[PDB]
């Protein structure tokens, strides 16, 4: 309502148009004031869902009592303790460095329960010699590597055992292949930690089914759909009190490790490896012409770009190490992987109504020895040969890989001979 | 639901005032007024009384 003009004259035709265009514009402008409320409700719903997720993947008061058995030796709860008091309890409960031989290349895990692996994992964080230097509180360490344990799903292959095996292989490379010389302690902390969270919430289907099924994952991200989902969940986990093992670091170191973790996690996508594989061979060749081993250290430990290309290759050399183990574990891991492949094939044929490809067809389960052979020639045989020419301590991996290839090819030949024999009549 | 019960049980009376052409009830919950002679005196009212110098007419 407008109540009086200043000239003295009454309102007329022009004033109605002038004061009606304004109200038409302001009436049309309420779209933004509606969108505002819609966004303010979506945000709250997302926060509530995040909290409900967080509750189910943490350690309650009665769950950590299975690892550090306080409340019996002392009257106080884990939270009301002194740092040196908990060390005495932790020393006597954790397994020794030489009980489970975690310093070898042949460590098999299927002879231990799912609770032992957590204690071995937190032992590894003491072997590096990193808890004292940065002063990470010792309750947070246990709670974190128990939450990560409960974070994985429960499926055939991509479960907690794979996540522990990758980290163990990376630790073995760091402390037995002597690749520790090129990196400082801070750049190994964030590699061993980033080895435990590389497949943290795997559904059980590769990146192609995600695009062919219009999962909400395929619209949020555009390239390397799954590998970017494992990173934000991990950074959400280690971003809260009682699980933040990075709180005692200062600003620069925290920024450095957070920048160094995403490269390691995203580098596990096989497609990126094929494209940026040549650049590693040039570094390998440049290493040769130098005079001595020691001099090469002082050159490599300074250039930054060249170290990242080596880390992003150690991550792939670790992610598929299950092919280099003795022929008592490979014969089972192969079938474990085949199970997941057949399950994805069944889902493809049942839901979206297409024909699965020969790789994922449950019927033709007799040509498995053949396909595997091709895999060894297609992807594995390069990463390991290059690392063998780089350092000399990583040769057993290569010879065991050769032996496994021989075995698989022998089985494939036998199967093909039987098939040809059956067709004679 | 807990507001339509008293009406259906004889506790209160149905509405009898004016209605907006799409059925809603007419009640103002804010009134912004400007004075531009002498003083700027901008004002906001959280709930207008029954007799404001604008709604009274």
């Amino acid at each position: 309502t407008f109540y009086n003009r200043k000239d003295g004259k009454p309102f007329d035709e022009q004033d109605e148009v002038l004061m009606e265009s304004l109200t038409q514009f302001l009436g049309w402008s309420v779209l933004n004031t509606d969108t505002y409320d819609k966004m303010n409700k979506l945000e709250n719903r997302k926060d509530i869902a995040q909290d409900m997720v967080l509750y189910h993947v943490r350690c309650d008061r009665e769950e950590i009592q299975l690892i550090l058995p306080t409340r019996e030796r002392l009257g106080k709860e884990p939270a009301d303790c002194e740092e040196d008091e908990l060390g005495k309890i932790l020393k006597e409960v954790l397994p020794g460095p030489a009980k489970f031989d975690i310093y070898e290349f042949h460590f098999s895990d299927l002879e231990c329960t799912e609770l032992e692996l957590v204690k071995c994992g937190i032992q590894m964080y003491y072997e590096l010699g990193v808890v004292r230097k940065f002063q990470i509180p010792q309750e947070v360490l246990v709670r974190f590597l128990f939450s990560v344990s409960k974070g994985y799903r429960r499926i055939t292959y991509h479960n907690w055992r794979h996540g522990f095996n990758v980290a163990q292989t990376m630790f073995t490379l760091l402390m037995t292949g002597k690749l520790k010389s090129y990196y400082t302690d801070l750049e190994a902390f964030a590699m061993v930690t980033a080895g435990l969270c590389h497949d943290i919430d795997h559904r059980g289907t590769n990146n192609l089914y995600q695009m062919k099924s219009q999962n909400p994952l395929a619209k949020l991200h555009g390239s390397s759909i799954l590998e970017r989902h494992h990173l934000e969940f991990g950074k959400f986990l280690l971003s809260e009190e009682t699980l933040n093992i990075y709180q005692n670091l200062n600003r620069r170191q925290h920024e450095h490790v957070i920048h160094l973790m995403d490269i390691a996690i995203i580098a596990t996508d096989l497609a990126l490896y094929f494209k940026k594989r040549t650049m590693f061979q040039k570094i390998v060749d440049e290493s040769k012409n130098y005079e001595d081993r020691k001099s090469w250290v002082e050159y490599l430990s300074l250039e930054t770009t060249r170290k990242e290309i080596v880390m992003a290759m150690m991550m792939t050399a670790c992610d598929l190490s299950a092919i280099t183990k003795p022929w008592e574990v490979q014969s089972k891991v192969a079938l474990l992987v085949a199970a997941e492949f057949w399950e994805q094939g069944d889902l493809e044929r049942t839901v979206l109504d297409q024909q699965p490809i020969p790789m994922m067809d449950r019927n033709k389960a007799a040509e498995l020895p053949k396909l595997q052979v091709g895999f060894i020639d297609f992807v594995c045989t390069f990463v390991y040969k290059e690392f063998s020419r780089f350092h000399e301590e990583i040769l057993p991996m290569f010879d065991r890989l050769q032996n496994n290839r021989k075995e698989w090819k022998a089985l494939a030949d036998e199967y093909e001979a039987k098939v040809k024999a059956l067709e004679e009549d | 639901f807990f507001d339509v019960w008293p009406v259906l049980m004889g506790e209160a009376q149905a509405y009898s005032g004016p209605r907006t052409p799409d059925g809603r009830e007419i009640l103002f919950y804010k009134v912004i007024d400007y004075i531009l002679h002498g003083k700027e005196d901008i004002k906001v009212i959280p709930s207008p009384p029954a007799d404001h110098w604008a709604l009274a007419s």
């Binding site: 490269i263 990126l272 494209k275 940026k276 650049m279 040039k282 770009t305 990242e308 290309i309 | -």
Partner: protein
């Protein structure tokens, strides 16, 4: 999206702008690229931008 909004706001005012032809071009807003695209430059391939 931006492309539709400009193509609905410029089509309605043909008459008021008495001109024969007019055109609009849209730039790209990507400041910093990923890590796996910078590497080929810092290692001696694909010489840097010059424009």
């Amino acid at each position: 999206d931006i492309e539709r909004q400009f193509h609905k706001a410029l089509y309605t005012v043909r008459a008021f702008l008495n001109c024969d032809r007019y055109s609009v071009g849209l730039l790209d807003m990507t400041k910093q690229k990923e890590f796996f695209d910078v590497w080929p430059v810092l290692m001696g391939e694909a010489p840097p931008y010059a424009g």
